[PDB]
Symmetry: C2
Subunit: 55 residues, 2 copies
């Protein structure tokens, strides 16, 4: 997924003719959710590594 | 105009986004009309040249 959800998409899949432009819903909220989940998962990873090192 | 009227056109003029496809009305009749007018004009040109040469 990367780190952001763009508001525009360029699509060239059949049956679309040549290349078309499509528009996404709530890109900003989805970006915020993505970043927050990444941060929480990183914290979990750090704590798990600390535990493993302690063992 | 050339010698034919194609049935499809590819257009990339503002405000159209990128390139779009457009469809023409009665391409075959217009092609026939174009060729017929060209032939008649050519006959007229030949006759006029013959007259001028005679003078």
């Amino acid at each position: 997924y990367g780190f952001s959800v763009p508001g525009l998409y360029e699509c060239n899949r059949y049956p679309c003719i040549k290349e078309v432009e499509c528009y996404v819903s709530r890109p900003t909220e989805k970006t915020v959710f993505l970043v927050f989940m990444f941060a929480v998962s990183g914290i979990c990873v750090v704590l798990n590594l600390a535990e493993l090192n302690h063992l």
